[PDB]
Amino acid sequence: RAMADQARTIRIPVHMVEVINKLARVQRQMLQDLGREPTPEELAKELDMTPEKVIEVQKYGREPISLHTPLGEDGDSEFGDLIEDSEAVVPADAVSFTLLQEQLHSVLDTLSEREAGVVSMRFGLTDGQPKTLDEIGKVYGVTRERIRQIESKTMSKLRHPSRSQVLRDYL
Amino acid sequence: DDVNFFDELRIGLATADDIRQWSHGEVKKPETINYRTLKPEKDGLFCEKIFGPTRDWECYCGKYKRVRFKGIICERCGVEVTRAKVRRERMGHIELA
Amino acid sequence: VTVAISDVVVPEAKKAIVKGYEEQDEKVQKQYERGLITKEERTQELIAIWTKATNEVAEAMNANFPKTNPIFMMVDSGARGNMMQMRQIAGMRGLVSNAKNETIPRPIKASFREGLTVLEYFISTHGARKGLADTALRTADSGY
Amino acid sequence: EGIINPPIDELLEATDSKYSLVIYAAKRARQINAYYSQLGEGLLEYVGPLVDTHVHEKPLSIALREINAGLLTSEAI
Amino acid sequence: ASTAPLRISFAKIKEPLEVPNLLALQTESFDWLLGNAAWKARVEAALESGQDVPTKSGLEEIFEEISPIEDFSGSMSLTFRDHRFEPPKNSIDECKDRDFTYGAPLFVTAEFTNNETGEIKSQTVFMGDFPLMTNKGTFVINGTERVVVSQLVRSPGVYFDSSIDKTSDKDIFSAKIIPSRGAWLEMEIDKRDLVGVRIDRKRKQSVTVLLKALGWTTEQILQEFGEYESMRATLEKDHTQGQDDALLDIYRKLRPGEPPTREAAQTLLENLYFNPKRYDLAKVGRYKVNKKLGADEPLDAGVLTTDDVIATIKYLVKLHAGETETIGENGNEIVVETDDIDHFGNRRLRNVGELIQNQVRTGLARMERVVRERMTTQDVEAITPQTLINIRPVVASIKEFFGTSQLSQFMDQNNPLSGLTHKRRLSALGPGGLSRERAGFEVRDVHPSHYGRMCPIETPEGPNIGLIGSLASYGRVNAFGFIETPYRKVVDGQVTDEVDYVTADEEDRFVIAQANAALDEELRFSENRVLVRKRGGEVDYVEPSDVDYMDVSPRQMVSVATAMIPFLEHDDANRALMGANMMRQAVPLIKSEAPLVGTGMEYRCATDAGDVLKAEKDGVVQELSADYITVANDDGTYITYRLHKFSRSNQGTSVNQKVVVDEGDRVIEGQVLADGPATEDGEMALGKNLLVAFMPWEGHNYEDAIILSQRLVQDDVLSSIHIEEHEVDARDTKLGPEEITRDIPNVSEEVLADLDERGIIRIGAEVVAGDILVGKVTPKGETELTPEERLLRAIFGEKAREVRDTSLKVPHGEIGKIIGVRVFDREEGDELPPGVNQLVRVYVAQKRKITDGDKLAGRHGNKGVISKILPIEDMPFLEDGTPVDIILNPLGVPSRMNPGQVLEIHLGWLASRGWDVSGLADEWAQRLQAIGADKVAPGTNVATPVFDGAREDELAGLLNHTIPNRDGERMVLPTGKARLFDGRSGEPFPDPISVGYMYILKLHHLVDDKLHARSTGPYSMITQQPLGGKAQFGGQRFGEMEVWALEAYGAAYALQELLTIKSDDVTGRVKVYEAIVKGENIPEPGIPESFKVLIKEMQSLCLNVEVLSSDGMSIEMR
Amino acid sequence: AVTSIRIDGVLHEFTTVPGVKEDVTDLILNIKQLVVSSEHDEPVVMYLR
Amino acid sequence: RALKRLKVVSAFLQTANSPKGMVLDCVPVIPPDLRPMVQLDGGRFATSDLNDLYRRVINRNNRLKRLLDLGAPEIIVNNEKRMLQEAVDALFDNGRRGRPVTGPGNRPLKSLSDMLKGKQGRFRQNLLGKRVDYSARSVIVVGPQLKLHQCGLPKAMALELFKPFVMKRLVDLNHAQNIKSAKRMVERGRTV
Amino acid sequence: LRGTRLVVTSYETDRGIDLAPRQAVEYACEKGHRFEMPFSVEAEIPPEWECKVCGIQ
């Protein structure tokens, strides 16, 4: 039990460890007796499980590599020095997003006051909280249905071959 | 924050009080990450209630999920809504028997 | 200025010089086969004789180069090179060290223009490799 | 013409050493660049250039030209 | 072979011996290991002639040694024997194509004996797939070609040494006994004349104590070690007596912890030294010990004996006393002297067979351990051998050796010479050897015993100088691992033709003559004073009465790569070393051309390397095409050979075999049918013959640079084809499997124009940086989107497909055609790894012409980067209007001391123009008339052997008797200099200039693969600095020295910005980029992340670090 | 001079056609030496069968 | 001997330090992102050898905590305490005392001290020398027509180093409408 | 090589946002440690917690 609970960095429940051990033992016995590497289907029919389960059990049991294993022949580099930080803020992307944010407001500027206001409140560009139609209509006092229609006309205007060019590139 | 302000850099001998004043919580299990969900395990070496959230402006369970809730301790899980870079700055501690 | 194998001119008086000293060398060797001297005396006498021969041949070569020679122009103007290399190319390469740092009494009497034999080339490889290794370790010692 | 001009000796005749000239020219160049960047706004802050320039000239070159011409002063604060 | 291309030779010494098979060094070892029919044929002929006697293959030896395996009760045993091999399951081509390992099954018949009832269960056992060696001495491991390099090690035995004691100026002597697979024991007579017997490097004990422990009384020691004073002094200063007391004292000394019993110490010592399982000096060790100490114990079994220890002590004490000779046990006489640990009497060679045998032995050790552990638990008589033998450790050991080992190296396939020289390599560093940084300066020197066993010129130039070398031309490895060399026997002063293979010690015994010594033509010496080698490698003059051996030929000491440099004796050793090291980097060109002037080794090297297709049996070419040759053998069978066309070598070059024979020609055995990567008609051809003039030209060849002509770009004289392979695989993920499809989510159809119906690029379609080769899509799942992007989607009404694109794109700065695509599907029976569902490989080829920045070189260590390419109309031209192809700087010749290149140029011009010297009754013309070099048609190749080439007198005479050109004028004067014109000005140059033909190589240091630049790219994880390398974008390093330089200048702001807003300041990089793009002032730097990481690392060590302000209050670092 | 070629069953230079003794890359070098003379300003086409 | 002792006894008498800081009661734990646990391509995971040491410490501590309150003889309790001390010692400095702890491949584990010492530590590899942006490298040839204050750069290297400046300039001249199109034009290598 | 810590990020800032309301609830320890905790107004208050000083209920 202790070896099942304190033997892997990424812990696995007891039953899954038992299944892994059973599969490994069966594979070893098949390899020894038959003289070749068993195929996934052979183990699947021997273990009475689908091949997908067999490959999943094979995958779960692997041991993580170490980031400190040296790969430099002279002994200076490490395996972990060549891993790229994928979730790293790329300055080009950040500047592109900032430019998009600044350009979006200008296109709304040419629209009428009510149109830009209702669009901003609905999509929460100014504050980030998308308010409900009743909330938007409370400020101007117009009806819910009016808020429904006024928004649609703005989308039709922007989704036209007259103001799309300024915003086509960013998509 | 400003290098110009740095006047001196002192070293010392950390005592128990300092060691548990740095820490944001005790680590009391040897687990790191779930083998199926691949998310940090509670009270493990990678816990989020101690070392901070792993998603910008989000908590573990997910009730609070945007910037508007900033600096709020979720009662369901205890994680505070803040950036994920704070995982580079928060320590823990182990209480030896 | 150009380089051609006719520009590398060996002294005409070198040959006789060497032959002269060669005879002298032979005498000493005979005295060793007769038991009148010990090994150290023979080695020291041969080294002295061949040092004298090397210096004399170097003087002859220095006196033989004309002023308008391309190689003498390279050396004289200070563009590139010195006199030891130009003595090795046209003259006598001299005495060489052993695997252990100690002079070999038998010299190299052929320059790179005339071409070395097999044993002479093998003897020179010793010093070549020692110099290369010395450079290799100096590179790091200086940095430290 | 280019990085070579204006001659360094003429510049050093107007200052104490190279170390002060570096700071002096850099500060003037920052002033010129700041003036250019916020030119769209109607603003009264920063001044220059005080010499005839090109279509797109590096502000550091203009700063060095003004320093050589003798149109600037340096004080100690 | 008789069907070799014509090449006139200037050699004047007739050789009596041909060069051996250059690849035997590895094929013979592996044949011995396996026990093939070839090894049986060799050993059969060995009987009654020579010594190739070893009658047991490696595997047979291991199986015989390991068996029998017996229980403690001894009632039952298991034995192996009679190993066998089966034909391989796959061919070489299939293994290289599908990434399999070339090997064969191994079977061993095992008997299963029971002492009760006389049981026997003789049955077959499958011991695994043993890798095999191809016909070219290379292994095919995981689809890649690999080479195992022999190892130079210190042979086991007994070694005596003496040094000087610094304090007292007194000699101190020591004597070690070092076995293979065992412990060490070393005696030493210290400054006080006391004799220590240090055991397993455990402090120090008196040798008298050991003698007492072994069962020697005081009287025997006194009577035997009587004449000497060290032994008496040690014996008196002992204060101990009794075998049991001494044995207990030894136990207390070596292994403290318990009060021991006399029986524990006895078995401890027996297991430490006298037990064969834990201690075994091999055959070589026993042989060396017998030679040194005079003992004549049999070589069959190796284990230390008390007689050996006593003899070692006697030898050491006699050496210390000052006696120079002794009468060894069971012998006549022996010399008492110290040993040199670098002599090839003490350094041996572990070849591929021995290394693989060691690995197999290590595997079988654990195999038998498991077998004996399992034997007891299971019930007796109810078992069969198949239930006992577990073959996992053996295969694990083999696969661990052939991967991630220093001696099994990626093969180097630039050209045939490089591949051949990768073999025949002796490496002194590796597992069990000595490490790079620890070697002194005595193991990196040219010992006088290297003559004919190891090349003194060909070695690396980096920090491996002296630790790696190449076997000589005639070198042959003894059965014990020592290298031999052949010598011609000379008797009565007459040089007979009998040849004897001699090793280092026997060589030291005799006196050896010189290869190129005057002979009367009666096989007798004429000078009456010959320069010879003596015992200590000392050269000395001796009369032709004492010489008893001679060299078989000159160039017996030089390797194969160094034997291809014409006029070697005229070059300095350093420049020759660089030239030999640089001849292995030449790239194969699209059109090969054999050297105009060379040595006689090109044909032999090209054919023996194995890169030239050769006929197997004589016949007539029946059918022929660029892809194959079908030959109708005389015996009645037909055989078809397939030629490699535009393959890819390990280094990325192109392997392409041309055809030589015609549709009607008759072929004999061994004849050449198809060339190789860099061979021309069956002989090596690495470069081109270019017309060269030595002169400084307008400073464009200043300081080793090179000026080329445009004719070498017009005619593809130096063009080469390079190939690269790109891989991409589709696997499983959490959100379903990835897919290789043409439906990339958001890209114009124009990009998806050359893609095939499967989403893979089409053959024959050119690509440039940015194009997609394979279209791949990976599902990403639902994610939260920023308000601006949501509004943009609402405006345009698009829908997130839930899948992103991860296609394969050509790297930055790459171009070329598409040669082929190969796709593996896991569901099609392909053996993809676990978790991979599909894989695909794309091959991209391109032809590169010579351009400035590329590096050229010659055979004499004269390299340089092309820095100019002039038009054809402004190169200097000879009197008849022929421009020169390359201009070199004269200043580099005299200072570097390599006059060989000038001679090569003169002889190249002579060979190109051809000569006719038949009627001249001149002294030099007589020699040519005796070697058939009278008339030579223009363009004919010539040969100048290494140390037996062409004398300058012959060249000077020949320069007056060439063939006049169409105008009846010889353009090159008898001084070797020609009158050139000026290409630009037009006025003739004031003085004549040297001109001729040089053989120029193209090195694999192209500038295309050297250039990289970055402005922003990937960053590392822990510390946020730019990533390093060139596969990525990569940033250049700013080390300590550059920081010191900037500090010395006084530049503080530049240093601050380099160290902060370019490497570590995470929030400053994006702000700097934004400021640059928007055109405003760069912001102030922050604080680097590395400092914060350092502070956290120190705080984790319970160190209370804290940064203070102008007053004493912590800043908290955010 | 000849400025381009196309063969019936060939896609690129680095391949060989059935029934010939030479590669396409070694045939381009042979047709690079053709000494042709043309009188047409525009490109002209020739056929080899 | 007294002088050497007084060199140490006096340090704690004057400064604010106390000797009690030489014996620990709680062990700090480094933040997770300085010992990352990355998922490579294909599901393979990579660790940093500090997770293993922390896990050893925590396992030994928890087992000791269970043993103490369970009630056990002094032998096993003392053995557990010795193991805990050895685990902490291996965490801080590995191989200083006894034999180093090893992992797969038979290589010593990297401890906290090993990250500061040596030619490959923080001090000498990351703080005094760094990798930098806006930098290129290439082989040099000779140009004799240049002046003493000039150099020649290949246009690929020049365009790569000066990408942001070029983008700004060709957005300024109206050759491009925005940064995105300017970046696309620069990457694809147009003529202007 | 490619690798990714299991961390998500968003292109989003702190400037120009209005924070939601919160309430500070006070908790006390046995030894006298007191602390405050911010919770959303639309939240339930649990009866028990862990201390911010000595890690006790």
Ligand SMILES: [Zn+2]
């Ligand atoms: Zn929550």
